[PDB]
Design an enzyme around this catalytic site. Structure first.
Site, PDB file in Angstrom:
ATOM      1  N   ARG A   1       6.045  -6.371   3.780  1.00 19.87           N
ATOM      2  CA  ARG A   1       4.776  -6.880   3.259  1.00 19.87           C
ATOM      3  C   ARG A   1       5.031  -6.717   1.746  1.00 19.87           C
ATOM      4  O   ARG A   1       5.092  -5.759   1.307  1.00 19.87           O
ATOM      5  CB  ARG A   1       3.590  -6.045   3.625  1.00 19.87           C
ATOM      6  CG  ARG A   1       2.181  -6.432   3.065  1.00 19.87           C
ATOM      7  CD  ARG A   1       1.173  -6.074   3.768  1.00 19.87           C
ATOM      8  NE  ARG A   1       0.732  -4.590   3.925  1.00 19.87           N
ATOM      9  CZ  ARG A   1      -0.403  -4.039   4.217  1.00 19.87           C
ATOM     10  NH1 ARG A   1      -1.064  -4.633   4.994  1.00 19.87           N
ATOM     11  NH2 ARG A   1      -0.613  -2.967   4.136  1.00 19.87           N
TER      12      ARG A   1
ATOM     13  N   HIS B   1       0.836  -1.114  -0.223  1.00 18.13           N
ATOM     14  CA  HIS B   1       0.136   0.071   0.086  1.00 18.13           C
ATOM     15  C   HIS B   1       0.931   1.272  -0.087  1.00 18.13           C
ATOM     16  O   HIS B   1       0.232   2.455  -0.090  1.00 18.13           O
ATOM     17  CB  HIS B   1      -0.971  -0.107   1.007  1.00 18.13           C
ATOM     18  CG  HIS B   1      -2.370  -0.784   0.914  1.00 18.13           C
ATOM     19  ND1 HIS B   1      -3.167  -0.320  -0.128  1.00 18.13           N
ATOM     20  CD2 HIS B   1      -2.668  -2.227   1.202  1.00 18.13           C
ATOM     21  CE1 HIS B   1      -4.004  -1.400  -0.383  1.00 18.13           C
ATOM     22  NE2 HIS B   1      -3.673  -2.369   0.589  1.00 18.13           N
TER      23      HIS B   1
ATOM     24  N   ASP C   1      -9.430  -3.744   5.402  1.00 16.26           N
ATOM     25  CA  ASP C   1      -9.833  -4.840   4.310  1.00 16.26           C
ATOM     26  C   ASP C   1     -10.898  -5.549   5.159  1.00 16.26           C
ATOM     27  O   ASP C   1     -11.565  -5.977   4.242  1.00 16.26           O
ATOM     28  CB  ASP C   1      -8.487  -5.613   3.844  1.00 16.26           C
ATOM     29  CG  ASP C   1      -7.896  -5.175   2.761  1.00 16.26           C
ATOM     30  OD1 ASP C   1      -8.431  -4.825   1.817  1.00 16.26           O
ATOM     31  OD2 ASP C   1      -6.598  -4.915   3.053  1.00 16.26           O
TER      32      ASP C   1
ATOM     33  N   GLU D   1      -8.049 -11.207   6.471  1.00 13.69           N
ATOM     34  CA  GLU D   1      -8.653  -9.965   6.185  1.00 13.69           C
ATOM     35  C   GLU D   1      -9.706  -9.908   5.276  1.00 13.69           C
ATOM     36  O   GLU D   1     -10.163  -8.968   4.617  1.00 13.69           O
ATOM     37  CB  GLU D   1      -7.473  -8.581   5.900  1.00 13.69           C
ATOM     38  CG  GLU D   1      -6.688  -9.086   4.586  1.00 13.69           C
ATOM     39  CD  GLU D   1      -5.557  -8.148   4.364  1.00 13.69           C
ATOM     40  OE1 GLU D   1      -4.695  -8.314   3.625  1.00 13.69           O
ATOM     41  OE2 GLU D   1      -5.798  -7.082   5.362  1.00 13.69           O
TER      42      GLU D   1
ATOM     43  N   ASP E   1      16.178 -12.709  -0.539  1.00 19.87           N
ATOM     44  CA  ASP E   1      17.420 -12.581  -0.922  1.00 19.87           C
ATOM     45  C   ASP E   1      18.061 -11.458  -0.425  1.00 19.87           C
ATOM     46  O   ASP E   1      19.378 -11.284  -0.059  1.00 19.87           O
ATOM     47  CB  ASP E   1      17.548 -13.089  -2.370  1.00 19.87           C
ATOM     48  CG  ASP E   1      17.675 -14.976  -2.500  1.00 19.87           C
ATOM     49  OD1 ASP E   1      18.193 -15.186  -1.482  1.00 19.87           O
ATOM     50  OD2 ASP E   1      17.273 -15.246  -3.633  1.00 19.87           O
TER      51      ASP E   1
END
Ligand SMILES: [Ca+2]
Ligand SMILES: [Ca+2]
Ligand SMILES: [Co+2]
Ligand SMILES: [Co+2]
Ligand SMILES: [Co+2]
Ligand SMILES: [Co+2]
Ligand SMILES: [Co+2]
Ligand SMILES: [Co+2]
Lengths: 253, 253, 253, 253, 253, 253
Positions: F72, F47, F177, F151, F86
């Site tokens: 996230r 977001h 959400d 969510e 990584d």
């Protein structure tokens, strides 16, 4: 603040909008284009080297000018659509849409639950101006415009079904992808291709949707305007830069 | 590896070189310009939003193409000249040079000690290809070209003296800065200004140095070419982008 | 928070510090260097394509590791020194210092008024962690370390005078710039140059200042360490990248 | 297009303007600040990690909003001033001005020849919108605003002389630099400092110039507003970010 | 202009090509690698922090040099393949290919309709040099080279089927991913793994396809070369940077 | 070097951790947040306008500070998870997880073969410090923490099944959400939503997994802390910047 009005969306029912393709992939280049006075600027996430961050930079550049921004993502990817809506792209052009099922998914991708599947993150979004637009979650879809590209045989095979999807505002014809799909790669000006393009525009308008197209050919762009096509892109910034520099050098070779 | 040959420097005594101004300040835009076939590309560090790192990106873009890169720093700053030479700019255009003393300092800024004051850092420089050009410190100055701009009254007042400075390869006339200095700001096309420009070109060539100029006016550029001017820039990328996009829109308003 | 302790500054009186030159000009490349275990890393703002923002990124990368950062600005420019101290560089290496007057100006450039001329902007500085280091304006100079380079004939001509400047913690010898200044460009290994370097190191240490140098020659670096040289850089990241890749290819040509 | 009106400059004679310091050095952070409704935003080139390109990005962000942009360069450097004017900064705040001679040079640095020494490059400048503002070279100075900082003993020693320089629109008092200069580093709230600040504001307004200042102390900012100070910055984005995050964590430790 | 000849593709049938892995993810680091003289450079989009824009910068850097660029995307994603081909990558290495069906989709991803599903956008592409390569849409596939990685048990389980896919030019063996898949993670040198690798190379060459591999072990890389393996990468830029810096420090600890 | 200990993972069973959301998408802004002393910082790839390269920059900033980084991604995309691991993200928060099948795939995406499907590229990864963590491939999973978001209604419909997936360390509730999914978009504070949130937290903790949530409402965050919720984010950097700047301006309007 009140949500930014989507004048592009409103004008789909009121006027013919002249568009410039922006593939120079850069906030400074987008600003130059924004000064010209095009009705709309297509920030190309599919065929120019853009990512979410470069598209944001170009949205910020263009925001100070009356030209309306339309963003093309690389594909109808639902998480990428979420990202482009949150940085504040109000009009999206989805490439290579081939079914009513895919067009309906693109509609949902642009709408908040419970009606759609747009991820909710208004506190973080330039789209809500970080909640400075206080009713954003209630009003957002009113100013979102979804356009889909019909530019393959499967698209044309599903044209009537796509045109019955509520929330598709416009269908855009891609003459490069379509001419290639029809076995006329690099030759969209062929009669076989043009007759399909004209018939497609007529069917889009007959279903009460906006029709769109890109042609750098002035005669073809004027013909599409004469047919009533609502959104016509008439050139490409990379093409105009290269051609103007070549034309100038040829005066001196 | 052998040092990159400066074909721009060599051609100052053998042909007239046609130039494009690059102010789009971006590696991708510089690459588009490089594909056209201009003799030289001016990467503008003075009047476009460039820094050392953006100029490097544009050098790297242009390097794959026969067009020769010339870099204009923001001013005749000796440490900045050192930086631009180390990233591998072989030709520099110094703005607003106004005395033989300043022109001599610019010569020294481009040469290693003990003759000059260029800082020594070959291991780190793209100019030496990080010492992959094994004799760089002995051969570097052979492929460095110094151009200075005369574009003020004090410049013209010191023209004969600047023209006797060994290691100044070329004097470039700046019509915008010069016309403003003469009280004809925005009006370089005035006869008073043009007679000064023509006489200056004649004096530069009479002293055995290369004369240069920029004009986006085709008739003026052709006249400068007829006078024997060695390096003529005939256009600017920002101007050609804006004009071509405006000219296109006006076909549809 | 308490001010970040400058362990480089402390170790000038306690041990010999092994350094790596960082000219890959990039936060990711600086992080790789930081993992090796060098006493110090020189972020080269003079001979690598760095600016304030790329130096900040490399300071952020290196900060998680015990290696101490030293920043070399392009020149002893007082406003740039201000910028580099505010992004949190605690040790500076000033190139081409040539007089006690210039060395004194560099001391002042690193100290707040009323004693110095460092501009005051602690609220905005990473140096104060945006005032999260609550007494920063009272304690800052305690952890600032000033090094100057002697690497020209004028430098050597002012050596005793520079060595009497309070607040110069160290004098670094530049063999590339100095060998060029002495007419031995590309040949610092010459006896004429080495005898001057050895005497200079002895004079620096006799005045109670730290002596420093860079040599990618292992035998020379070990000799400088045997003379008691406090801060010795033993290699350059660009040089080690290029050599290691050339040495590998040669096993397969 | 007509030149962008400088509402900040106009409002110096009509109202008191509330300002926010922008040192987050980033187009996205500048846009967040631009949504709040400050009269002016100070893009800090002196004490935040900004360069010409990052300042352009923040100008482009802020351009879509009514907040007026003011840019502080790192120093009164004439070539840097040229660059910041060409990217379209219409109001400049010059740090550490200490004489009428330096203030007059800053006036000339903002004006085209023949009256000033501003370099002429309108074809390339966002300031002229790449000559889309067709009379830019005739009208530009009308919308340019020059502010100078008095923030040292030498500045105060030259205050009456600076206040008689035509083309200085405003004098801004720097309490951090000034309190340090007066031997009260980190203690601008001391009576000795405040009495000098109040007297300085009174003298600036008595000479018919705008007075400005920054204080994150609400009581001091309100007192400065009560004295009639024309442009008051009342906070700093880095400070508000750090304090709001610390205040929130302390509710949960 | 004519299309850039893919010398890597040509040399798959004529010689053994020595490769360097490029994961420093940066145009400047890619340029240093390009100066060494490797047959090919692998720009790693899978295991280095690269995106389309950083890959483009590295393509621009490398383009001035004879080393051929090969790009590895993060996965066999058809829209990303479209993006990488349009920025001008002529050779692609697709990770973790596990069926003839997937390999066939990767062939189509690289070919224009009507034969393939590569999206058509030549006006905007560096691949066509913005249509400066005038017949690009007719000739493009001639210079495109598709390599697939077999590096999982499912890959080996579908090896004969993948090797019968027309348009797969080469199969690259991934020893790290394959050794992990075989329960020998971090131990590719084990005989069980090496016997499978050798048989796989023999089967690839017996089907008339090019075999490729990466080993930083010199003895293993030489054995693969003795087996006739067409494209062997012999090292990694991050690994060589870290090792060379560790080896240097250990001479001084 | 030994692998970086994941103190976030360890503290899930020993204390309640206070979190800040980082959506300013920038290394400099992440560093400011890191100075505050939050237990954890959520670098938002879903977001906020982040990509792999911006997330790396923020990891490098935060690494010098005790605050633990959690990343996230935009979606549960297996190749993107490989990239984020990584660059050295040890804790991931996967949005919109809706089945045990999807939760199991996220577990595998975080583990090397033969147990999982994480791609193997240790030589190139900041995660292994380019193999400077010598046993990384054997020890990596010990310090990886997987969190999944519930969510949506389908999430809640599959809650018991997700809670029986070994290798899911924590379930995070997304109130924005979830409230939208329940037909209470923009109104998470409704009793209907809160009773579902409380019951979900209780069920998560009863199955022996860590529960997490974000609320910028202090009273709600304290109630979630009283219920024993292991990881609570209490604010968002974009929201705190906008609110603090608005609150300040309103003291002066
Ligand atoms: Ca920069
Ligand atoms: Ca990027
Ligand atoms: Co298309
Ligand atoms: Co000029
Ligand atoms: Co030196
Ligand atoms: Co100040
Ligand atoms: Co692999
Ligand atoms: Co959520």
């Amino acid at each position: 603040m009140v949500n930014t009005v989507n004048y592009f969306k409103q004008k789909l029912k009121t006027e013919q909008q002249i568009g410039m393709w922006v593939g120079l992939a850069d906030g400074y280049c987008a600003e130059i284009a924004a000064n010209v006075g095009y009705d709309w600027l297509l920030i190309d996430g599919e065929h120019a080297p853009n990512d979410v961050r470069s598209i944001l930079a170009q949205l910020q550049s263009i925001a100070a000018y009356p030209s309306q921004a339309v963003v093309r993502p690389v594909s109808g990817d639902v998480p990428l659509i979420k990202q482009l809506l949150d940085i504040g792209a109000q009009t999206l052009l989805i490439p290579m849409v081939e079914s009513a099922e895919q067009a309906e998914l693109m509609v949902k991708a642009t709408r908040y639950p419970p009606e759609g599947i747009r991820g909710v993150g208004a506190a973080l979004a330039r789209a809500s101006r970080w909640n400075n637009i206080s009713d954003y979650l209630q009003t957002a879809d009113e100013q979102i415009c979804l356009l889909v590209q019909v530019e393959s045989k499967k698209g044309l095979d599903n044209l009537d079904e796509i045109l019955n999807v509520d929330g598709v505002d416009g269908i855009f014809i891609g003459p490069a992808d379509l001419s290639a799909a029809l076995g006329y790669r690099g030759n969209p000006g062929h009669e076989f291709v043009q007759n399909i393009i004209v018939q497609t525009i007529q069917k889009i308008r007959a279903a009460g949707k906006a029709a769109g197209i890109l042609s750098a050919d002035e005669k073809l762009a004027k013909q599409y305007l004469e047919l009533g096509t609502e959104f016509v892109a008439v050139g490409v910034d990379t093409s105009l830069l290269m051609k103007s520099m070549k034309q100038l050098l040829s005066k001196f070779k």
